[PDB]
Design a protein around this ligand. Structure first.
Ligand SMILES: OC[C@H]1O[C@H](O[C@H]2[C@H](O)[C@@H](O)[C@H](OCCCCCCC3CCCCC3)O[C@@H]2CO)[C@H](O)[C@@H](O)[C@@H]1O
Ligand SMILES: *[B]([O])([O])[C][N]C(=O)[C]([N]C(=O)N1[C]=[C]N([C][C])C(=O)C1=O)C1=[C][C]=C([O])[C]=[C]1
Length: 265
C-alpha cells in the first residue's frame, strides 16, 4: 500500500471528492496522522454512537435506565429500521434501542433515542457540555443524511469526532460500566464489523460505526489496533463524490490498508 497521505490523495483524485481522516491514540489523544481533520463532513449514522453516549450519561445521572421498555407505534417509523419494525407489539428497552441504532444502524431506534435526549438540539447541547464546540446535529433520521454542499447541518470534523469519541470512551465522564457498554456496542456492529474483521490481518482489534448519505457521503468511526487492543480511534469521511457505493467502500478500505501497513509507534 502507499503511505497513508499518498493513498488519501489518490482517493480524492479518483473520487473527485473530499476525504477527511484522523488517527488518534485512545488513551492520550495523541494525533498520529490527519488529513482535512478540521474540515466539516456529514456525520450520517456515525452520530448514533454520540447519541448513545448522551443516553448513557442520562443513565449515569439517574434520569434513564437501559432496562426501561419503550412502546412505540408504526407511525413513528422511518425507513431502514430492520430491528425496531419487528417490535411494534412488544416494544424495546432503551439498551436494545442503542444496540439496534449502533449495530444495525436502525433509524427509528435512533429517532426514539434522540427524543429522549431533547432532540437534535439536546444532543448538540450535550456535545457542547463535553467541550465539543464544533459537532452539531440539526435534523432527525433520515433527513440528516442529505449532505448538501455549504450546509453545516448535521456535520462534525474528523478531529472533533475523534476527540468526542475519546471523551465518551475513556475520560471518566461516563461511568465505568457506561464506557464499557458504549465500546461493546461498537464491537458488536453487524453492518460492517464482521466484513471488516474478516479482511483485517490477524491480531487487529476492530470496533466501528458506519454511515452513508447522499452525494457520495460515506464514513466510519472505528477503534483499531494490533495485538488485539483498541489502541487508536480512526475516523474516515468521504463527501461530494459521484462514485458508486462499491468504490466508496473500496477507497475507505484502501485508506485503512495504508494506515494499517504503515502503523507508527
Ligand atoms: O503486511 C501487513 C498486512 O498486509 C496485508 O493485510 C491487508 C489485508 O489483506 C487487506 O484486506 C486489508 O484491507 C483493509 C480493509 C480494512 C477495512 C476498512 C478499514 C476501516 C476500519 C478501520 C479504520 C477505518 C477504516 O489491508 C491490509 C493491509 O494491506 C496482508 O494480508 C497481511 O497478511 C499483512 O499482515
Ligand atoms: B445513517 O448513515 O444516517 C443511515 N443512513 C440512511 O438512512 C441513508 N438514507 C438516506 O441517505 N436518505 C436520504 C434522504 N431521505 C429522503 C427523505 C431518505 O429517504 C434517505 O433515507 C441511507 C444511505 C444509503 C443506503 O443504501 C440506505 C440508506
Amino acid at each position: 500500500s502507499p503511505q497513508p497521505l499518498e493513498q488519501i490523495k489518490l482517493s480524492e483524485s479518483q473520487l473527485s471528492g473530499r476525504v477527511g481522516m484522523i488517527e488518534m491514540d485512545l488513551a492520550s489523544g495523541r494525533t498520529l496522522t490527519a488529513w482535512r481533520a478540521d474540515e466539516r463532513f456529514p456525520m450520517m449514522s456515525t452520530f448514533k454512537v454520540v447519541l448513545c453516549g448522551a443516553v448513557l450519561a442520562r443513565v449515569d445521572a439517574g434520569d434513564e435506565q437501559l432496562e426501561r421498555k419503550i412502546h412505540y407505534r408504526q407511525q413513528d417509523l422511518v425507513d431502514y429500521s430492520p430491528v425496531s419494525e419487528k417490535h411494534l407489539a412488544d416494544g424495546m428497552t432503551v439498551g436494545e434501542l442503542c444496540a439496534a441504532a449502533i449495530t444495525m444502524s436502525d433509524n427509528s431506534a435512533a429517532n426514539l433515542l434522540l427524543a429522549t435526549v431533547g432532540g437534535p438540539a439536546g444532543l448538540t447541547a450535550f456535545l457542547r457540555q463535553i467541550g465539543d464546540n464544533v459537532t452539531r446535529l440539526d435534523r432527525w433520521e433520515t433527513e440528516l443524511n442529505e449532505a448538501l454542499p455549504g450546509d453545516a447541518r448535521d456535520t462534525t470534523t474528523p478531529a472533533s469526532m475523534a476527540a468526542t469519541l475519546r471523551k465518551l470512551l475513556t475520560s471518566q465522564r461516563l461511568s465505568a460500566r457506561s464506557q464499557r457498554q458504549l465500546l461493546q456496542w461498537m464491537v458488536d456492529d453487524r453492518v460492517a464489523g464482521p466484513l471488516i474483521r474478516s479482511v483485517l490481518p490477524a491480531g487487529w482489534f476492530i470496533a466501528d460505526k458506519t454511515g452513508a448519505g447522499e452525494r457520495g457521503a460515506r464514513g466510519i468511526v472505528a477503534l483499531l489496533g494490533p495485538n488485539n487492543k483498541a489502541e487508536r480511534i480512526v475516523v474516515i469521511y468521504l463527501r461530494d463524490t459521484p462514485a458508486s457505493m462499491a468504490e466508496r467502500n473500496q477507497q475507505i478500505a484502501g485508506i485503512g490498508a495504508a494506515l494499517i501497513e504503515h502503523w507508527q509507534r
